[PDB]
Symmetry: C2
Protein backbone atom coordinates (compact mmCIF):
# COMPACT_ATOMS: atom_id res chain seq x y z
CA UNK A 1 0.00 0.00 0.00
CA UNK A 2 1.38 3.39 -1.10
CA UNK A 3 -0.01 6.76 0.02
CA UNK A 4 0.59 9.48 -2.58
CA UNK A 5 -0.10 13.19 -2.22
CA UNK A 6 -2.24 15.15 -4.65
CA UNK A 7 -0.64 17.10 -7.49
CA UNK A 8 -0.13 20.78 -6.71
CA UNK A 9 -2.08 20.89 -3.43
CA UNK A 10 -1.72 20.03 0.25
CA UNK A 11 -5.39 18.93 0.26
CA UNK A 12 -6.12 15.25 -0.22
CA UNK A 13 -4.15 12.09 -0.90
CA UNK A 14 -4.53 8.85 -2.84
CA UNK A 15 -4.11 5.36 -1.40
CA UNK A 16 -3.08 2.73 -3.95
CA UNK A 17 -2.84 -1.01 -3.39
CA UNK A 18 -5.16 -1.09 -0.37
CA UNK A 19 -6.88 -4.39 0.43
CA UNK A 20 -8.84 -4.22 3.67
CA UNK A 21 -8.70 -8.01 4.07
CA UNK A 22 -4.88 -7.89 4.16
CA UNK A 23 -4.20 -4.39 5.54
CA UNK A 24 -2.04 -4.36 8.66
CA UNK A 25 -2.92 -2.37 11.75
CA UNK A 26 0.07 -0.22 10.79
CA UNK A 27 -1.59 0.37 7.41
CA UNK A 28 -4.80 1.61 9.05
CA UNK A 29 -2.98 4.05 11.34
CA UNK A 30 -0.94 5.38 8.42
CA UNK A 31 -4.17 6.09 6.52
CA UNK A 32 -5.74 7.60 9.64
CA UNK A 33 -2.84 10.05 10.04
CA UNK A 34 -3.19 10.95 6.36
CA UNK A 35 -6.90 11.63 6.86
CA UNK A 36 -6.38 13.96 9.82
CA UNK A 37 -3.66 16.02 8.09
CA UNK A 38 -4.54 15.76 4.37
CA UNK A 39 -8.27 15.95 5.31
CA UNK A 40 -9.35 13.36 2.70
CA UNK A 41 -7.91 10.03 1.57
CA UNK A 42 -9.16 8.40 -1.63
CA UNK A 43 -8.75 4.62 -1.74
CA UNK A 44 -8.31 3.40 -5.32
CA UNK A 45 -9.59 0.24 -6.99
CA UNK A 46 -12.16 -0.63 -4.32
CA UNK A 47 -14.69 -3.23 -5.56
CA UNK A 48 -16.65 -4.22 -2.46
CA UNK A 49 -20.05 -5.69 -1.71
CA UNK A 50 -22.10 -3.77 0.89
CA UNK A 51 -21.02 -6.23 3.59
CA UNK A 52 -17.34 -5.78 2.72
CA UNK A 53 -17.76 -2.00 2.56
CA UNK A 54 -19.16 -2.03 6.10
CA UNK A 55 -16.27 -4.21 7.26
CA UNK A 56 -13.78 -1.76 5.73
CA UNK A 57 -15.55 1.02 7.62
CA UNK A 58 -15.48 -0.93 10.88
CA UNK A 59 -11.66 -0.97 10.65
CA UNK A 60 -11.69 2.83 11.06
CA UNK A 61 -14.15 3.18 13.94
CA UNK A 62 -17.57 2.36 15.33
CA UNK A 63 -20.36 2.92 12.77
CA UNK A 64 -23.25 5.29 13.45
CA UNK A 65 -26.61 4.54 11.87
CA UNK A 66 -28.28 7.61 10.37
CA UNK A 67 -31.23 8.62 12.54
CA UNK A 68 -33.81 8.64 9.72
CA UNK A 69 -34.55 5.14 8.35
CA UNK A 70 -35.63 6.46 4.92
CA UNK A 71 -31.91 6.68 4.04
CA UNK A 72 -31.04 3.11 5.10
CA UNK A 73 -29.66 0.41 2.87
CA UNK A 74 -32.22 -2.44 3.01
CA UNK A 75 -29.67 -5.10 4.05
CA UNK A 76 -27.16 -3.10 6.15
CA UNK A 77 -28.71 -0.23 8.09
CA UNK A 78 -25.25 1.24 8.71
CA UNK A 79 -25.07 2.18 5.01
CA UNK A 80 -26.59 5.55 4.09
CA UNK A 81 -27.85 5.57 0.49
CA UNK A 82 -27.98 8.57 -1.84
CA UNK A 83 -29.70 7.35 -4.99
CA UNK A 84 -32.12 8.51 -7.67
CA UNK A 85 -32.47 5.02 -9.19
CA UNK A 86 -35.97 3.54 -8.55
CA UNK A 87 -40.52 1.91 -9.45
CA UNK A 88 -39.88 2.55 -5.76
CA UNK A 89 -37.01 4.70 -4.51
CA UNK A 90 -34.20 3.15 -2.46
CA UNK A 91 -32.35 5.66 -0.32
CA UNK A 92 -32.85 9.39 -0.91
CA UNK A 93 -32.14 11.29 -4.16
CA UNK A 94 -29.14 13.63 -4.34
CA UNK A 95 -28.44 14.20 -0.66
CA UNK A 96 -26.27 16.97 0.72
CA UNK A 97 -26.80 19.74 -1.87
CA UNK A 98 -25.83 22.34 0.73
CA UNK A 99 -22.80 23.22 2.85
CA UNK A 100 -22.68 21.04 5.96
CA UNK A 101 -20.68 18.82 8.25
CA UNK A 102 -22.22 15.42 8.85
CA UNK A 103 -24.34 15.05 12.01
CA UNK A 104 -23.52 18.68 12.88
CA UNK A 105 -27.19 18.94 13.94
CA UNK A 106 -26.80 15.98 16.35
CA UNK A 107 -25.48 16.07 19.93
CA UNK A 108 -22.56 13.67 19.30
CA UNK A 109 -21.03 14.13 15.83
CA UNK A 110 -18.64 11.48 14.52
CA UNK A 111 -15.09 12.00 13.31
CA UNK A 112 -14.91 10.15 9.99
CA UNK A 113 -17.18 10.05 6.92
CA UNK A 114 -16.82 7.37 4.24
CA UNK A 115 -18.31 7.80 0.76
CA UNK A 116 -18.32 4.93 -1.76
CA UNK A 117 -19.71 5.97 -5.17
CA UNK A 118 -21.63 3.24 -7.01
CA UNK A 119 -22.91 5.06 -10.13
CA UNK A 120 -21.17 8.24 -11.28
CA UNK A 121 -22.41 10.60 -14.02
CA UNK A 122 -19.56 11.61 -16.32
CA UNK A 123 -20.15 15.38 -16.05
CA UNK A 124 -21.25 17.84 -13.36
CA UNK A 125 -20.84 15.35 -10.49
CA UNK A 126 -18.58 15.83 -7.50
CA UNK A 127 -18.17 17.20 -3.99
CA UNK A 128 -17.09 20.64 -2.78
CA UNK A 129 -14.95 20.90 0.35
CA UNK A 130 -13.80 23.64 2.71
CA UNK A 131 -11.25 23.09 5.48
CA UNK A 132 -12.82 25.06 8.33
CA UNK A 133 -9.54 24.87 10.24
CA UNK A 134 -7.69 26.68 7.47
CA UNK A 135 -10.76 28.90 7.03
CA UNK A 136 -10.41 30.02 10.66
CA UNK A 137 -6.70 30.82 10.26
CA UNK A 138 -7.46 32.95 7.18
CA UNK A 139 -10.02 35.01 9.08
CA UNK A 140 -9.10 38.60 9.99
CA UNK A 141 -8.15 39.15 13.61
CA UNK A 142 -11.42 41.07 14.04
CA UNK A 143 -13.46 37.94 13.30
CA UNK A 144 -10.99 35.76 15.23
CA UNK A 145 -11.64 37.78 18.40
CA UNK A 146 -15.39 37.99 17.76
CA UNK A 147 -15.87 34.20 17.61
CA UNK A 148 -14.01 33.62 20.88
CA UNK A 149 -16.10 32.21 23.73
CA UNK A 150 -19.21 31.93 21.54
CA UNK A 151 -21.34 28.87 20.72
CA UNK A 152 -22.84 27.66 17.46
CA UNK A 153 -26.46 26.48 17.31
CA UNK A 154 -27.09 23.75 14.74
CA UNK A 155 -30.37 22.32 13.47
CA UNK A 156 -31.65 20.08 10.68
CA UNK A 157 -34.88 22.08 10.27
CA UNK A 158 -33.72 23.81 7.08
CA UNK A 159 -32.85 20.74 4.98
CA UNK A 160 -34.98 18.05 6.62
CA UNK A 161 -36.33 16.07 3.67
CA UNK A 162 -40.04 15.36 3.24
CA UNK A 163 -40.65 11.62 3.52
CA UNK A 164 -43.25 9.47 1.71
CA UNK A 165 -45.37 9.09 4.86
CA UNK A 166 -45.38 12.88 5.38
CA UNK A 167 -47.86 13.34 2.50
CA UNK A 168 -51.14 15.01 3.59
CA UNK A 169 -49.63 15.96 6.98
CA UNK A 170 -49.93 19.62 8.06
CA UNK A 171 -46.47 21.13 7.81
CA UNK A 172 -46.58 22.54 11.36
CA UNK A 173 -46.77 18.98 12.71
CA UNK A 174 -43.58 18.11 10.82
CA UNK A 175 -41.83 21.20 12.22
CA UNK A 176 -42.85 20.10 15.72
CA UNK A 177 -41.50 16.59 15.10
CA UNK A 178 -38.20 18.13 13.98
CA UNK A 179 -37.91 20.14 17.20
CA UNK A 180 -38.81 17.15 19.39
CA UNK A 181 -36.72 14.44 17.70
CA UNK A 182 -33.81 16.60 16.47
CA UNK A 183 -33.70 19.76 18.60
CA UNK A 184 -31.04 22.42 17.98
CA UNK A 185 -27.72 21.39 19.50
CA UNK A 186 -25.00 23.66 20.87
CA UNK A 187 -21.27 23.34 20.22
CA UNK A 188 -18.46 25.79 20.97
CA UNK A 189 -18.04 28.11 18.00
CA UNK A 190 -14.39 27.00 17.77
CA UNK A 191 -12.77 23.91 19.24
CA UNK A 192 -9.36 22.27 19.38
CA UNK A 193 -9.03 19.38 16.94
CA UNK A 194 -8.53 16.35 19.24
CA UNK A 195 -5.96 14.81 16.86
CA UNK A 196 -4.15 17.69 15.13
CA UNK A 197 -4.59 20.42 17.75
CA UNK A 198 -5.59 23.02 15.16
CA UNK A 199 -8.53 25.37 15.73
CA UNK A 200 -11.70 24.56 13.76
CA UNK A 201 -14.53 27.01 13.08
CA UNK A 202 -17.52 24.67 13.42
CA UNK A 203 -20.24 26.24 11.27
CA UNK A 204 -22.00 25.44 8.02
CA UNK A 205 -24.63 27.28 6.00
CA UNK A 206 -26.90 24.23 5.92
CA UNK A 207 -27.06 23.34 9.61
CA UNK A 208 -25.87 26.35 11.65
CA UNK A 209 -28.92 28.51 12.38
CA UNK A 210 -27.55 30.97 14.96
CA UNK A 211 -24.97 31.82 17.58
CA UNK A 212 -25.09 32.21 21.36
CA UNK A 213 -22.85 33.47 24.13
CA UNK A 214 -21.53 31.32 26.98
CA UNK A 215 -24.77 31.92 28.92
CA UNK A 216 -27.06 30.78 26.10
CA UNK A 217 -28.26 34.22 24.99
CA UNK A 218 -28.57 34.56 21.19
CA UNK A 219 -26.11 36.79 19.35
CA UNK A 220 -28.02 39.68 17.77
CA UNK A 221 -25.33 40.73 15.28
CA UNK A 222 -24.93 39.46 11.72
CA UNK A 223 -21.70 37.71 12.77
CA UNK A 224 -22.90 34.31 11.52
CA UNK A 225 -23.65 35.58 8.01
CA UNK A 226 -20.28 37.37 7.93
CA UNK A 227 -18.56 34.10 8.90
CA UNK A 228 -20.38 32.35 6.04
CA UNK A 229 -19.21 35.15 3.74
CA UNK A 230 -15.57 35.13 4.85
CA UNK A 231 -15.15 31.34 4.76
CA UNK A 232 -16.59 31.17 1.23
CA UNK A 233 -19.92 29.48 1.97
CA UNK A 234 -21.96 32.19 0.21
CA UNK A 235 -20.10 32.15 -3.14
CA UNK A 236 -22.48 30.32 -5.47
CA UNK A 237 -19.79 30.37 -8.18
CA UNK A 238 -17.60 28.10 -5.99
CA UNK A 239 -14.42 29.90 -7.08
CA UNK A 240 -13.55 31.04 -3.54
CA UNK A 241 -10.00 30.19 -2.52
CA UNK A 242 -11.18 28.04 0.42
CA UNK A 243 -13.17 25.73 -1.88
CA UNK A 244 -11.88 22.45 -3.31
CA UNK A 245 -13.83 20.54 -5.96
CA UNK A 246 -13.19 16.80 -6.19
CA UNK A 247 -14.54 14.50 -8.92
CA UNK A 248 -14.61 10.84 -7.81
CA UNK A 249 -14.03 8.16 -10.41
CA UNK A 250 -15.14 4.53 -10.43
CA UNK A 251 -13.34 2.52 -7.77
CA UNK A 252 -12.71 5.48 -5.46
CA UNK A 253 -13.59 5.18 -1.77
CA UNK A 254 -13.41 8.47 0.12
CA UNK A 255 -12.65 8.86 3.83
CA UNK A 256 -12.42 12.43 5.08
CA UNK A 257 -12.15 14.49 8.27
CA UNK A 258 -15.72 15.22 9.40
CA UNK A 259 -14.40 17.57 12.11
CA UNK A 260 -12.37 19.91 9.88
CA UNK A 261 -14.26 19.74 6.56
CA UNK A 262 -17.63 20.99 5.44
CA UNK A 263 -18.88 19.67 2.13
CA UNK A 264 -21.64 20.05 -0.42
CA UNK A 265 -22.70 17.80 -3.27
CA UNK A 266 -22.38 18.68 -6.95
CA UNK A 267 -25.07 16.86 -8.94
CA UNK A 268 -26.43 17.11 -12.46
CA UNK A 269 -29.71 18.90 -13.14
CA UNK A 270 -30.93 15.76 -14.93
CA UNK A 271 -32.53 12.43 -13.96
CA UNK A 272 -29.29 10.67 -14.90
CA UNK A 273 -28.58 7.80 -12.47
CA UNK A 274 -26.30 8.60 -9.54
CA UNK A 275 -25.73 6.38 -6.49
CA UNK A 276 -23.38 6.70 -3.50
CA UNK A 277 -23.08 4.65 -0.31
CA UNK A 278 -22.14 6.36 2.96
CA UNK A 279 -20.72 4.90 6.18
CA UNK A 280 -20.00 7.09 9.21
CA UNK A 281 -17.86 6.03 12.18
CA UNK A 282 -16.70 7.40 15.52
CA UNK A 283 -12.94 7.38 15.89
CA UNK A 284 -11.05 7.37 19.19
CA UNK A 285 -12.30 10.85 20.16
CA UNK A 286 -15.52 12.82 20.36
CA UNK A 287 -15.89 16.12 18.49
CA UNK A 288 -13.30 17.63 20.85
CA UNK A 289 -11.61 16.49 24.05
CA UNK A 290 -13.39 17.24 27.30
CA UNK A 291 -16.73 17.53 25.50
CA UNK A 292 -19.51 17.84 28.15
Amino acid sequence: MEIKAQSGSSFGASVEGFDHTTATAEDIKAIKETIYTKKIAVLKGQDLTPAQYLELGKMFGRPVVYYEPMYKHPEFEEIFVSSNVPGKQIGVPKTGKFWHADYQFMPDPFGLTLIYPQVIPQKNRGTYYIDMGKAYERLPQELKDEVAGLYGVHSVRKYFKIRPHDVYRPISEILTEIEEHTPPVRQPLTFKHPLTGETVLYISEGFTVGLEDADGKPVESDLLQRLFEATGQLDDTFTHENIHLFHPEQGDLLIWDNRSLIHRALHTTTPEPVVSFRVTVHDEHKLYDGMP
Copy 2:
Protein backbone atom coordinates in the same frame (compact mmCIF):
# COMPACT_ATOMS: atom_id res chain seq x y z
CA UNK B 1 -90.38 25.28 -0.17
CA UNK B 2 -90.49 25.60 3.62
CA UNK B 3 -87.87 26.91 6.06
CA UNK B 4 -88.06 25.77 9.69
CA UNK B 5 -85.92 26.35 12.74
CA UNK B 6 -84.86 23.22 14.64
CA UNK B 7 -86.34 23.91 18.11
CA UNK B 8 -81.72 26.37 19.25
CA UNK B 9 -81.33 29.71 17.44
CA UNK B 10 -78.50 28.11 15.41
CA UNK B 11 -79.45 26.38 12.20
CA UNK B 12 -82.44 26.00 9.91
CA UNK B 13 -83.60 23.26 7.55
CA UNK B 14 -84.95 23.95 4.06
CA UNK B 15 -87.51 21.42 2.82
CA UNK B 16 -88.92 21.12 -0.67
CA UNK B 17 -86.05 22.91 -2.41
CA UNK B 18 -85.40 21.93 -6.04
CA UNK B 19 -82.76 24.13 -7.68
CA UNK B 20 -84.20 23.30 -11.11
CA UNK B 21 -87.61 24.79 -10.22
CA UNK B 22 -86.86 27.19 -7.34
CA UNK B 23 -87.71 30.85 -7.84
CA UNK B 24 -85.63 33.95 -7.14
CA UNK B 25 -87.74 34.55 -4.03
CA UNK B 26 -86.87 31.07 -2.77
CA UNK B 27 -83.16 31.77 -3.27
CA UNK B 28 -83.41 35.11 -1.46
CA UNK B 29 -85.38 33.58 1.41
CA UNK B 30 -82.63 30.97 1.79
CA UNK B 31 -79.93 33.66 1.62
CA UNK B 32 -81.64 35.69 4.36
CA UNK B 33 -81.83 32.55 6.51
CA UNK B 34 -78.13 31.80 5.95
CA UNK B 35 -76.99 35.22 7.16
CA UNK B 36 -79.35 35.03 10.18
CA UNK B 37 -79.37 31.37 11.28
CA UNK B 38 -75.73 30.97 10.10
CA UNK B 39 -76.33 27.54 8.50
CA UNK B 40 -79.10 26.34 6.18
CA UNK B 41 -79.55 22.58 5.73
CA UNK B 42 -81.10 21.76 2.35
CA UNK B 43 -82.95 18.47 2.83
CA UNK B 44 -83.42 15.64 0.37
CA UNK B 45 -80.97 16.84 -2.29
CA UNK B 46 -80.19 14.30 -5.04
CA UNK B 47 -77.55 15.80 -7.33
CA UNK B 48 -74.78 14.77 -9.68
CA UNK B 49 -71.53 16.78 -9.57
CA UNK B 50 -72.76 18.93 -12.47
CA UNK B 51 -76.16 19.62 -10.88
CA UNK B 52 -74.48 20.45 -7.56
CA UNK B 53 -72.35 23.08 -9.30
CA UNK B 54 -75.45 24.50 -10.98
CA UNK B 55 -77.05 24.76 -7.54
CA UNK B 56 -74.04 26.64 -6.16
CA UNK B 57 -74.02 29.15 -9.02
CA UNK B 58 -77.54 30.22 -7.99
CA UNK B 59 -76.02 31.48 -4.72
CA UNK B 60 -73.12 33.46 -6.18
CA UNK B 61 -69.85 33.33 -8.11
CA UNK B 62 -67.86 30.16 -7.31
CA UNK B 63 -64.21 30.47 -6.26
CA UNK B 64 -61.72 27.79 -7.32
CA UNK B 65 -59.46 26.58 -4.52
CA UNK B 66 -55.92 27.72 -5.22
CA UNK B 67 -54.21 24.37 -4.56
CA UNK B 68 -55.21 22.02 -7.43
CA UNK B 69 -54.60 18.88 -5.32
CA UNK B 70 -58.12 19.24 -3.86
CA UNK B 71 -59.83 19.64 -7.24
CA UNK B 72 -62.59 17.39 -8.51
CA UNK B 73 -61.42 15.67 -11.72
CA UNK B 74 -64.09 17.14 -14.02
CA UNK B 75 -65.28 20.28 -12.15
CA UNK B 76 -62.44 22.35 -10.71
CA UNK B 77 -64.95 24.44 -8.75
CA UNK B 78 -65.59 21.37 -6.57
CA UNK B 79 -63.25 20.96 -3.60
CA UNK B 80 -63.08 17.26 -2.68
CA UNK B 81 -62.48 15.95 0.85
CA UNK B 82 -61.99 12.18 0.69
CA UNK B 83 -60.18 9.41 2.56
CA UNK B 84 -60.77 6.85 -0.22
CA UNK B 85 -57.46 6.01 -2.01
CA UNK B 86 -56.59 9.15 -4.71
CA UNK B 87 -58.88 12.09 -5.48
CA UNK B 88 -59.40 14.78 -2.89
CA UNK B 89 -57.42 15.05 0.33
CA UNK B 90 -57.86 13.05 3.56
CA UNK B 91 -58.14 14.30 7.14
CA UNK B 92 -58.92 17.88 6.14
CA UNK B 93 -59.96 20.68 8.46
CA UNK B 94 -58.94 19.15 11.79
CA UNK B 95 -58.50 22.68 13.18
CA UNK B 96 -60.72 25.68 13.84
CA UNK B 97 -60.77 27.86 10.75
CA UNK B 98 -62.82 30.07 8.47
CA UNK B 99 -62.52 29.21 4.80
CA UNK B 100 -59.99 31.30 2.83
CA UNK B 101 -59.24 33.32 5.97
CA UNK B 102 -55.58 33.21 4.86
CA UNK B 103 -56.49 34.81 1.51
CA UNK B 104 -56.93 38.50 0.61
CA UNK B 105 -60.53 38.18 -0.67
CA UNK B 106 -62.51 35.70 1.46
CA UNK B 107 -65.89 34.56 0.13
CA UNK B 108 -69.11 34.79 2.09
CA UNK B 109 -70.78 31.41 1.53
CA UNK B 110 -69.54 27.82 1.79
CA UNK B 111 -71.51 24.86 0.44
CA UNK B 112 -70.90 21.26 1.57
CA UNK B 113 -72.53 18.26 -0.13
CA UNK B 114 -71.63 14.95 1.56
CA UNK B 115 -71.32 12.03 -0.86
CA UNK B 116 -70.61 9.06 1.45
CA UNK B 117 -72.04 9.37 4.97
CA UNK B 118 -71.04 6.45 7.24
CA UNK B 119 -73.33 5.24 9.99
CA UNK B 120 -70.59 6.44 12.32
CA UNK B 121 -71.66 10.02 11.68
CA UNK B 122 -68.97 12.43 10.49
CA UNK B 123 -70.30 15.82 11.57
CA UNK B 124 -68.81 19.30 11.79
CA UNK B 125 -68.21 21.65 14.72
CA UNK B 126 -69.17 25.32 14.48
CA UNK B 127 -68.64 28.50 16.47
CA UNK B 128 -70.44 31.76 15.66
CA UNK B 129 -67.64 34.32 16.02
CA UNK B 130 -70.19 37.14 16.14
CA UNK B 131 -71.87 35.72 19.23
CA UNK B 132 -68.43 34.74 20.55
CA UNK B 133 -67.51 38.43 20.44
CA UNK B 134 -70.72 39.51 22.20
CA UNK B 135 -70.11 37.02 25.04
CA UNK B 136 -66.59 38.35 25.64
CA UNK B 137 -65.97 40.28 28.87
CA UNK B 138 -66.06 44.02 28.32
CA UNK B 139 -62.33 44.49 28.96
CA UNK B 140 -61.53 41.81 26.37
CA UNK B 141 -63.71 43.75 23.92
CA UNK B 142 -61.68 46.85 24.81
CA UNK B 143 -58.38 45.09 24.06
CA UNK B 144 -59.71 44.15 20.62
CA UNK B 145 -60.89 47.49 19.20
CA UNK B 146 -58.59 48.90 16.53
CA UNK B 147 -56.34 45.85 16.20
CA UNK B 148 -55.64 43.73 13.12
CA UNK B 149 -55.48 39.97 12.60
CA UNK B 150 -52.68 38.34 10.60
CA UNK B 151 -53.76 35.16 8.82
CA UNK B 152 -51.57 32.58 7.08
CA UNK B 153 -51.91 29.07 5.67
CA UNK B 154 -48.33 28.21 6.71
CA UNK B 155 -49.38 26.12 9.71
CA UNK B 156 -51.93 23.72 8.18
CA UNK B 157 -50.62 23.63 4.61
CA UNK B 158 -50.78 19.95 3.67
CA UNK B 159 -47.76 18.15 2.22
CA UNK B 160 -48.46 17.08 -1.37
CA UNK B 161 -47.14 13.97 -3.17
CA UNK B 162 -44.79 16.11 -5.28
CA UNK B 163 -43.24 17.53 -2.09
CA UNK B 164 -41.51 14.24 -1.19
CA UNK B 165 -37.69 14.48 -0.90
CA UNK B 166 -37.78 18.29 -1.03
CA UNK B 167 -36.11 20.15 1.85
CA UNK B 168 -38.83 21.53 4.09
CA UNK B 169 -37.51 25.11 4.01
CA UNK B 170 -38.11 25.26 0.25
CA UNK B 171 -41.79 24.43 0.80
CA UNK B 172 -42.08 27.16 3.44
CA UNK B 173 -40.53 29.61 0.98
CA UNK B 174 -43.00 28.49 -1.70
CA UNK B 175 -45.88 29.01 0.75
CA UNK B 176 -44.67 32.54 1.49
CA UNK B 177 -44.49 33.49 -2.19
CA UNK B 178 -47.78 31.95 -3.35
CA UNK B 179 -49.91 32.66 -0.24
CA UNK B 180 -48.26 35.32 1.95
CA UNK B 181 -49.89 36.34 5.24
CA UNK B 182 -52.93 38.60 4.98
CA UNK B 183 -54.16 41.35 7.31
CA UNK B 184 -57.80 41.98 8.22
CA UNK B 185 -59.30 44.14 10.97
CA UNK B 186 -59.64 42.17 14.19
CA UNK B 187 -63.38 42.91 14.14
CA UNK B 188 -65.62 43.97 11.28
CA UNK B 189 -69.24 44.83 10.60
CA UNK B 190 -71.10 41.98 8.91
CA UNK B 191 -72.20 43.54 5.58
CA UNK B 192 -75.54 41.67 5.63
CA UNK B 193 -76.57 41.77 9.30
CA UNK B 194 -74.57 44.61 10.87
CA UNK B 195 -73.24 42.49 13.73
CA UNK B 196 -69.64 42.61 14.95
CA UNK B 197 -67.56 39.54 14.04
CA UNK B 198 -64.33 38.62 15.84
CA UNK B 199 -62.43 37.33 12.79
CA UNK B 200 -59.85 34.90 14.18
CA UNK B 201 -59.25 31.16 14.04
CA UNK B 202 -56.70 28.90 15.72
CA UNK B 203 -55.86 27.32 12.36
CA UNK B 204 -55.10 30.43 10.30
CA UNK B 205 -54.65 33.46 12.60
CA UNK B 206 -50.94 33.57 13.45
CA UNK B 207 -50.79 36.93 15.25
CA UNK B 208 -52.28 40.32 16.02
CA UNK B 209 -51.07 43.77 14.99
CA UNK B 210 -51.33 47.30 16.35
CA UNK B 211 -53.39 50.01 14.72
CA UNK B 212 -49.97 51.23 13.52
CA UNK B 213 -48.98 47.78 12.22
CA UNK B 214 -46.76 46.79 15.16
CA UNK B 215 -47.07 43.16 16.31
CA UNK B 216 -48.92 42.75 19.60
CA UNK B 217 -46.38 40.99 21.83
CA UNK B 218 -49.04 40.26 24.46
CA UNK B 219 -50.77 36.88 24.70
CA UNK B 220 -54.08 38.43 23.63
CA UNK B 221 -54.55 36.05 20.69
CA UNK B 222 -54.27 32.94 22.88
CA UNK B 223 -56.64 34.49 25.41
CA UNK B 224 -59.06 35.25 22.57
CA UNK B 225 -58.74 31.63 21.39
CA UNK B 226 -59.57 30.39 24.89
CA UNK B 227 -62.42 32.85 25.46
CA UNK B 228 -64.19 31.91 22.21
CA UNK B 229 -63.88 28.17 22.93
CA UNK B 230 -61.24 27.26 20.33
CA UNK B 231 -58.85 25.68 22.88
CA UNK B 232 -61.39 23.29 24.43
CA UNK B 233 -60.32 19.84 23.24
CA UNK B 234 -63.38 18.36 24.97
CA UNK B 235 -65.68 20.39 22.67
CA UNK B 236 -67.92 21.16 25.65
CA UNK B 237 -67.66 24.97 25.40
CA UNK B 238 -70.98 26.81 25.15
CA UNK B 239 -69.98 28.42 21.84
CA UNK B 240 -69.53 25.06 20.10
CA UNK B 241 -72.25 23.40 18.03
CA UNK B 242 -71.81 19.88 16.64
CA UNK B 243 -73.90 19.39 13.50
CA UNK B 244 -74.71 15.88 12.30
CA UNK B 245 -75.70 15.51 8.62
CA UNK B 246 -77.98 12.89 7.12
CA UNK B 247 -78.12 11.33 3.68
CA UNK B 248 -79.63 14.04 1.51
CA UNK B 249 -78.26 17.07 3.36
CA UNK B 250 -76.59 19.99 1.61
CA UNK B 251 -75.05 22.59 3.92
CA UNK B 252 -74.68 26.31 3.15
CA UNK B 253 -73.31 28.48 5.93
CA UNK B 254 -72.07 31.99 6.69
CA UNK B 255 -68.32 31.95 6.00
CA UNK B 256 -67.98 35.40 7.60
CA UNK B 257 -69.53 34.64 10.99
CA UNK B 258 -68.72 30.94 11.40
CA UNK B 259 -65.53 29.06 12.10
CA UNK B 260 -65.58 25.29 11.81
CA UNK B 261 -63.49 22.16 12.22
CA UNK B 262 -63.72 18.43 11.54
CA UNK B 263 -64.28 15.68 14.10
CA UNK B 264 -61.55 14.77 16.56
CA UNK B 265 -61.99 11.01 16.16
CA UNK B 266 -59.99 9.40 13.36
CA UNK B 267 -62.39 8.07 10.75
CA UNK B 268 -62.10 4.40 9.71
CA UNK B 269 -65.02 4.39 7.27
CA UNK B 270 -64.94 5.90 3.78
CA UNK B 271 -66.23 9.48 3.78
CA UNK B 272 -66.35 11.93 0.86
CA UNK B 273 -67.58 15.54 0.71
CA UNK B 274 -67.91 17.94 -2.22
CA UNK B 275 -67.37 21.62 -1.40
CA UNK B 276 -68.31 24.66 -3.48
CA UNK B 277 -67.19 28.11 -2.28
CA UNK B 278 -68.93 31.18 -3.57
CA UNK B 279 -68.87 35.01 -3.48
CA UNK B 280 -72.11 36.65 -2.36
CA UNK B 281 -72.54 40.20 -3.72
CA UNK B 282 -70.41 41.55 -0.85
CA UNK B 283 -66.76 41.37 0.17
CA UNK B 284 -65.69 40.35 3.69
CA UNK B 285 -66.90 43.75 4.92
CA UNK B 286 -68.08 46.91 3.20
CA UNK B 287 -65.14 49.22 2.54
CA UNK B 288 -62.31 46.74 2.02
CA UNK B 289 -59.09 48.19 0.57
CA UNK B 290 -58.49 47.13 -3.02
